[PDB]
Design a protein around this ligand. Structure first.
Ligand SMILES: CC(C)[C@H](NC(=O)[C@H](C)[NH3+])C(N)=O
Ligand SMILES: [Zn+2]
Length: 104
């Protein structure tokens, strides 16, 4: 499925931080569930797979160093929830950093 780039959330049942935080339960995985939920993510129940409530973007195989907001921006740069919370400048920094990380 294509990512949602409108200002309307794909999963409004998951729009509230507390609804998202409940989806995780006991979380054994390397990224903090609070940090994931704050970045718009809720758990699927399939390992560490999370999905953004707004763009619907899905992310698996989280590494212990990784920032949910940065990953959100790397893979789902069209997310309007990301844009609202972070600003296009944060988003561009992240992309520049990512694109420069591979070049080096
Ligand atoms: C690499 C690929 C599985 C990707 N996951 C990540 O980059 C994680 C979150 N660091 C994804 N699209 O799920
Ligand atoms: Zn999103």
């Amino acid at each position: 499925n294509f990512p949602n780039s409108t200002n309307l959330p794909r999963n409004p049942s998951m729009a509230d931080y507390e609804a998202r935080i409940f989806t995780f339960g006991t979380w054994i995985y390397s990224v903090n569930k609070e940090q994931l939920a704050r970045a718009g993510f809720y758990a699927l129940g399939e390992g560490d797979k999370v999905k953004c409530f707004h763009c619907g973007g899905g992310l698996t195989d989280w590494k212990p160093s990784e920032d949910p907001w940065e990953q959100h921006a790397k893979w789902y740069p069209g997310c309007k929830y990301l844009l609202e919370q972070k600003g296009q400048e944060y988003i561009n920094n992240i992309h520049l950093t990512h694109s420069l990380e591979e070049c080096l």
